[PDB]
Amino acid sequence: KVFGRCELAAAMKRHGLDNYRGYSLGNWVCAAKFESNFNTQATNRNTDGSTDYGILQINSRWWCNDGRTPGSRNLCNIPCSALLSSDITASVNCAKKIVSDGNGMNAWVAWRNRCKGTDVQAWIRGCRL
């Protein structure tokens, strides 16, 4: 499913991401935009053999099981395919674990390089949240 900007904003808010660990909703929408272009089915293979899944491009090396990333952890306790669903719940719940992991949202390269320090409020402007 390819979410609309405000549709995703509302879904993320409903799932408790607004200000989760101090990160305003605009941060989450911006990260999703640049990680997956709001597409829940996005996947990208990394050089180490791991793969990123879903709207938040969660990595199989640590957070989910895809059965093809040797010696990886499954810290979110879910098959990576769960992260591609039209229902963002699994992605959000896992993201909460990631963001609490100590490095905050810096865990998402696109957020660090494209959202961090920018006017992220712009990502929710105009939405009825």
Residues facing 52 on adjacent strands = 44, 59
Chain positions 31 to 60 lying near Na ion, rule: CB under 5 A, are 60
Nearest-angstrom CA–CA distance, 115 and 51: 22
For this structure, is 52 an active site residue? yes
Q: Is 101 labeled as ligand-binding?
A: yes
Catalytic hit among 7, 35, 87, 119: 35
5 or 114: whose CB is closer to Cl ion? 114
Chain positions 83 to 112 lying near Cl ion, rule: CB under 5 A, are 104
Closest residue by Cα to residue 83 from 51, 37, 111? 51
Which of Na ion, Cl ion, none binds 69 (CB below 5-8 Å, type-dependent)? Na ion
Closest residue by Cα to residue 85 from 42, 34, 129, 33? 42
Q: What is the β-pairing status of strands 58-59 and 51-53? A: antiparallel
Smallest distance, Å, CB 66 to Cl ion? Answer: 27
Nearest-angstrom CA–CA distance, 55 and 53: 7
Q: Which residues bind Na ion (CB under 5 A)?
A: 60, 65, 69, 72, 74
The catalytic residues are 35, 52
Q: Which residues bind Cl ion (CB under 5 A)?
A: 104
